Design a protein around this ligand. Structure first.
Ligand SMILES: [Mg+2]
Ligand SMILES: [Mg+2]
Ligand SMILES: [Zn+2]
Lengths: 116, 108, 107, 49, 162, 107, 184, 77, 50, 242
RNA sequence: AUAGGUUUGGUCCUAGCCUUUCUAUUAGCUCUUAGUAAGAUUACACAUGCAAGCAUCCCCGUUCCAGUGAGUUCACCCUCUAAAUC
């Protein structure tokens, strides 16, 4: 299909039931839908903890060196996972959300010390 | 047919034949016009209370009323179903009992 | 490189009844998916020439063009493989009929 | 420095070539510019409605 | 039964038993064979049996057959560059010429063995294909993960009745 | 086959299904059987197995009562046998009925 | 009360002997070909309806994983595959009990079965690679410095702070300084 | 979604869209994160497009591609 | 193949009722300065520009 | 100099591993295809026996005894920034095909903001949640426990355990080693030694023993049947190893 | 198809019809509770309400998603190459 504004973007895809999400990294064009087609299938993302504490994830990395090597953008939740993979720098937006609970903990230890 | 013959023909090639109830639909509604009686084919002898219905289409097809009694007269909406009635020689539709104006049978 | 598809073809001329082109009948072998025997499915390709070398009945090579040069002209007759009758028998290159040597070897 | 994995990866492969070469894996930065977000555009890239 | 004379030629296992697959630069193989020669029986049993096996493996090369156009049987090939190989076949069997092309214009087995891994890598094992392209549509369809809430009732850590 | 002693068997009767010509044609075929001891005796040659549970071992079945012929057999491959269409199209396995791959009782 | 004392005792050899359990039962159905989904329930909760299943007519045949020879009766001897339900004619609820307890007893090892001799995962057994050998660690990280010194709060001079007060005068928020580093 | 025309009804003719607030102790490091993140990523892009370019160069006119390309035109002749 | 004459033509007069009478810089960019509404656009302005 | 994969020390333990071809290629219990019929003369029988011994040798060449583990846990990145901010343990896997298996980068993240390096128990499991093959349930099956094993050595099942480890645990691990030696211990107590004679008998039984000086339990076997040079060409092998 | 019933006074053969199996919708009678899938028939008419906004204004985007099956050989491969992202 010929779209408008098209570029390849590395995105997540929902392949689950209700109350069991599963995310699936693919390379897809900008405009084709979430549960639509793609150009190449990448790693997977398990968003729920199984037995003995595990929220799994994959990264088919030597072709994301190719598919970002042809100049494809990414999505803001996708860079949350490559950056926390140590493949890419830790996301500064994730660093804010890392820090804005320390601020919540800078009023949590207050409300527990102003009390007791 | 030799080998050059069967390549010229190709595979087998068939249509269906959609039956009595128009273009192979399960049930069909209609309105009754006449409830008369028809006499069966040669091994059998009875007289079977079968109606005439114009369907949803507007086609009058003669139809069979199963069960002991019929109450239908001339304006009632009945829902016909397509089973051939084997001692009638061309009655192909039947009414389902307990529907849309015709109720169930009077059980003793 | 080129734009037309079938790059390299040998065929047979049917009719040269236009000017500086010939009508060439070529046969592939395609398989029946069921009957599983190979059958000559033909197709008709045009062939452009310069010298009007071909006559109606010869077996011709024809090479594809980088661009079609008409609506239907597609290849040029790059070589004429088997002449009508005057077939040079390609190993032992000398004139012959069907199966019999006109100019016999040991010449 | 490279991010923790490609920094870990490339030094391992040189160790598979046969030259040890224990220099730190540094990628250039000066070859990429630093225009912040109020650098202006050029007008024929845009188009008036 | 089957309707031929030698009816094993039409079985789709036979057509794969041929092994002579042509390089990318052969674009026409044209065969010419006598019909009643006592000396050319290999080029009669060539086109009788073997060239259906060739066409199933290089299915885009044009093959064409002529009957009484020449006293001696031959093959002639039409390469992409423009030269014409002239294989001769006279007083050979149909067996030697299934060996005389695979050593000339048949692909090297090194060049087909390296052609067999790349047909595998695009059917890569850890993709999650819809049971037609690859396995495991869910991660529930490997063990250890929380399994697909049609298969189990899932714990109360879900929404909706949380 | 329960009365003969046969425990595993595939058989399909095509054509007419008549209960007497079936059995008099059952006992006709099953009487004319090539035993493997008699498979040797006509040809003199040695009879083996190649099973799917064992390896490629040529495990022996029957040997002649006496001598053995020396020459290797004339192995003219892909033989002139009238092989049946309802079994080789099965071995390709495209066409399917809802009446073949079934789960019935224990015979 | 805890079987495997039944399959060798005297009510067994006076009922079945050398034949399998299912050698008298074969089912009642319509014409010809029997249905693929066998009846699921042999007994429903208080009583049994009609003909009972082979493992439902006896109340003294109960299946488990240590009933070694009874479970051998429902696997073909030279073909290791469990029979489908309409071969035996058992209820398929009892055949879910038989498709676990075979494998539950296959997984305990008290039933002999086949495993093919396999080929290894890799042709190389070399273990000197930078993920599996040792890794020369970071000249930042040996020193107590993380990566990339821009993570920790380089608090700006006040000139950049007051830049927004004349940009965003009607809307600001009030704060504290650099973070407290670790947690309880 | 909308299809150029449909009347953009009463809910959003005016809904005054005030923004969230600004974090100047962190925003003047958050602005200093992004120029330290957009520039480092833009260094990895030219690591990889040049990488992909050599992966095209090694199979077009590559040193073991040229040796293959002269091999076959010998083993042909 | 269908030649699409009225589709081509109504393009070339759509450009002609765009090229010849393109609306100039003023009558879209006038602002009613009290409600921050403009003629010919309907859209008022973001929060950092009041 | 110890060096099990030397060229001559195989050829003796390959030789004292028996040929005994009917025990080797028993018919496996599987779903059989109906047997195929070849008819081969005494000239072409002998080329088909020798093929079945040419194909028998290649089933007698794997494994080696393979260098008991070291547990690799070094940390590459340990950021003091995350540390208990967002939990549950991400595990990162490089996937392609054209990298070999021990050359693979599998990385875990921790709720405390470290980057741990996926200890040896996890990495081969993380291969098998992703790169599946024959048998191989990715967790520990309930056969390999000491009680569930002690049912199994009763049933003349030692090849059946030695062929279970060859899927489940790679022979450089410890859970291959701690349940192979759990088997060859119990092979010696009540010595039942003629059971392992032509599947991985080049080193699984003897190269355990020649390190562990319990070879008196293996030479009684070499005088019970006949096995004459079989005895003497390993009592020499005590001195040239130790 | 592992096939079975039916031409006749009967047999054999050719033969169609039907039965047995599976799936999908409607209809009857009937129905305890959770979970996941799935859910106008009609390209027939539509009351209503919601479905494109973001943003230091410009632009961009509402040409995408989502829908339906009216029509129909504009879907796949090669050549040449234009918009789009690097
Ligand atoms: Mg409407
Ligand atoms: Mg239509
Ligand atoms: Zn699911």
């Amino acid at each position: 299909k010929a779209y408008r504004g098209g570029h390849l973007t590395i995105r997540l895809a929902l392949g689950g039931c209700t109350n069991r999400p599963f995310y699936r990294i693919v390379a897809a064009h900008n405009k084709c839908p979430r549960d639509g087609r793609f150009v190449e299938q990448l790693g997977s993302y398990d968003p729920l903890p199984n037995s003995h504490g595990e929220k799994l994830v994959a990264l088919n990395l030597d072709r994301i060196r190719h598919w970002i090597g042809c100049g494809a953008h990414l999505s803001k939740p996708m860079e949350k996972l490559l950056g926390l993979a140590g493949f890419f720098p830790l996301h500064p937006m994730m660093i804010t959300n890392a820090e804005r609970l320390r601020r919540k903990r800078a009023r949590e230890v207050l409300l527990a010390s102003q009390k007791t | 047919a030799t080998l050059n013959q069967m390549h010229r023909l190709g595979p087998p090639k068939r249509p269906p034949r959609k039956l009595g109830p128009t273009e192979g639909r399960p049930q069909l509604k209609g309105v009754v016009l006449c409830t008369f009686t028809r006499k069966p084919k040669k091994p059998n002898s009875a007289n079977r209370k079968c109606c005439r219905v114009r369907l949803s289409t507007g086609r009058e097809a003669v139809c069979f009323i199963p069960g002991e009694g019929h109450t239908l007269q001339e304006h009632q909406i009945v829902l016909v179903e397509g089973g051939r009635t084997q001692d009638l020689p061309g009655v192909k539709l039947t009414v389902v009992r307990g529907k849309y104006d015709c109720g169930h049978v009077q059980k003793k | 490189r080129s734009s037309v598809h079938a790059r390299w073809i040998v065929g047979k001329v049917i009719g040269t009844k236009m000017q500086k082109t010939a009508k060439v009948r070529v046969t592939r072998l395609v398989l029946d998916p069921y009957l599983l025997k190979y059958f000559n499915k033909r197709k008709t390709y045009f062939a452009h020439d310069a010298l009007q070398q071909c006559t109606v009945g010869d077996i011709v090579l024809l090479r594809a063009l980088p661009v079609p040069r008409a609506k239907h002209v597609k290849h040029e007759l790059a070589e004429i493989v088997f002449k009508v009758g005057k077939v040079i028998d390609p190993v032992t290159g000398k004139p012959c009929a069907g199966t019999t040597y006109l100019e016999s070897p040991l010449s | 420095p490279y991010p923790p994995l490609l920094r870990a990866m490339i030094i391992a492969e040189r160790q598979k070539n046969g030259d040890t070469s224990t220099e730190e894996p540094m990628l250039n930065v000066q070859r990429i510019r630093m225009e912040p977000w109020d650098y202006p555009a050029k007008q024929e890239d845009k188009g008036r409605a | 039964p089957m309707k031929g004379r030698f009816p094993i030629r039409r079985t789709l296992q036979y057509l794969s038993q041929g092994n002579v697959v042509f390089k990318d630069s052969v674009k026409v193989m044209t065969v010419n064979y006598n019909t009643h020669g006592e000396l050319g029986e290999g080029a009669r049993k060539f086109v009788f049996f073997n060239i259906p096996q060739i066409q199933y493996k290089n299915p885009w090369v044009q093959i064409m057959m002529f009957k009484n156009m020449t006293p001696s049987p031959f093959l002639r090939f039409y390469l992409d560059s423009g030269e014409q190989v002239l294989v001769d076949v006279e007083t050979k069997s149909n067996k030697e010429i299934m060996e005389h092309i695979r050593k000339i214009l048949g692909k090297n087995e090194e060049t087909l063995r390296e052609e067999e891994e790349e047909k595998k890598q695009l059917s890569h094992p850890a993709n999650f294909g819809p049971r037609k392209y690859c396995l495991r549509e869910c991660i529930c369809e490997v063990e250890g993960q929380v399994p697909c809430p049609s298969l189990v009732p899932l714990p109360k850590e879900m929404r909706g009745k949380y | 086959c329960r009365l003969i002693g046969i425990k595993d068997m595939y058989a399909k009767v095509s054509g007419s299904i008549n209960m007497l010509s079936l059995t008099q044609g059952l006992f006709r075929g099953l009487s004319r059987q090539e035993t493997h001891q008699q498979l040797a005796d006509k040809k003199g040659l040695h009879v083996v197995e190649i099973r799917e549970e064992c390896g490629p071992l040529p495990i022996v079945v029957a040997s002649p009562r006496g001598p053995l012929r020396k020459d290797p057999e004339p192995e003219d491959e892909v033989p002139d046998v009238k092989l049946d269409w309802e079994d080789v199209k099965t071995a390709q396995g495209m066409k399917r009925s809802v009446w073949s791959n079934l789960k019935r009782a224990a015979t | 009360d805890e079987p495997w004392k039944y399959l060798e005792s005297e009510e067994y050899q006076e009922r079945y002997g050398s034949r399998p359990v299912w050698a008298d039962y074969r089912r009642n159905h319509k014409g010809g070909v029997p249905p693929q989904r066998t009846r699921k329930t042999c007994i429903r909760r208080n009583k049994v309806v009609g003909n009972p299943c082979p493992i439902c007519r006896d109340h003294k045949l109960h299946v488990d994983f240590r009933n070694v020879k009874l479970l051998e009766q429902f696997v073909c001897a030279h073909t290791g595959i469990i029979f489908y339900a309409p071969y035996t004619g058992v209820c398929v609820k009892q055949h879910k009990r038989l498709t676990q307890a075979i494998q539950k007893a296959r997984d305990h090892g008290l039933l002999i079965y086949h495993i093919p001799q396999v080929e290894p995962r890799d042709l190389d057994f070399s273990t000197s690679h930078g993920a599996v050998s040792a890794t020369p660690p970071a000249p930042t990280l040996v020193s107590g410095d993380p990566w990339y010194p821009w993570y920790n709060w380089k608090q700006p001079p006040e000139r950049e702070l007051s830049r927004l007060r004349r940009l965003y005068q009607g809307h600001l928020q009030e704060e504290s300084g650099p973070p407290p580093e670790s947690m309880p | 979604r909308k299809t150029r025309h449909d009347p953009l009804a009463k809910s959003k003719i005016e809904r005054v869209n005030m923004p969230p607030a600004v974090d100047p102790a962190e925003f003047f490091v958050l602005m200093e994160r992004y120029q330290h993140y957009r520039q480092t990523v833009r260094a990895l892009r030219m690591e990889f497009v040049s990488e992909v370019q050599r992966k095209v160069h090694e199979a077009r006119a590559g040193v073991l591609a040229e040796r293959k390309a002269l091999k076959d035109a010998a083993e042909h002749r | 193949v269908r030649p699409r004459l009225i589709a081509e033509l109504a393009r070339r007069v759509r450009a002609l009722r765009e090229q010849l009478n393109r609306p100039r810089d003023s009558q879209l960019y006038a602002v009613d300065y009290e409600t921050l509404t403009r003629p010919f656009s309907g859209r008022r302005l973001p929060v950092r520009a009041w | 100099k110890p060096t099990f994969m030397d060229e001559e020390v195989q050829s003796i333990l390959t030789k004292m591993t028996g040929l005994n071809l009917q025990k080797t290629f028993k018919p496996a219990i599987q779903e059989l295809k109906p047997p195929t019929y070849k008819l081969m003369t005494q000239a072409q029988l002998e080329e088909a026996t020798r093929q079945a011994v040419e194909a028998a040798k290649v089933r007698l060449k794997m494994p080696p005894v393979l260098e008991e583990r070291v547990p690799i846990n070094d940390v590459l990145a340990e950021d003091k920034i995350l540390e208990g901010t967002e939990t549950t343990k991400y595990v990162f896997t490089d996937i392609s095909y054209s990298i070999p298996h021990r050359e693979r980068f599998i990385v875990v993240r921790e709720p405390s903001g470290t980057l741990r390096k996926a200890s040896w128990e996890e990495r081969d499991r993380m291969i098998q949640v992703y790169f599946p093959k024959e048998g191989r349930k990715i967790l520990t099956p309930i056969i390999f426990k000491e009680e569930n094993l002690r049912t199994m050595y009763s049933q003349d099942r030692h090849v059946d355990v030695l062929n279970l480890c060859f899927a489940q645990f790679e022979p450089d691990s410890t859970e291959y080693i701690k349940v192979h030696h759990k088997t060859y211990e119990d092979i010696d107590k009540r010595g039942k030694y003629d059971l392992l004679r032509s599947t991985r008998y080049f080193g699984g039984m003897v190269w355990y023993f020649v390190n562990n000086k319990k070879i008196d339990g293996l030479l009684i076997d070499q005088i019970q049947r006949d096995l004459i040079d079989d005895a003497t060409n390993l009592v020499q092998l005590y001195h040239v190893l130790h």
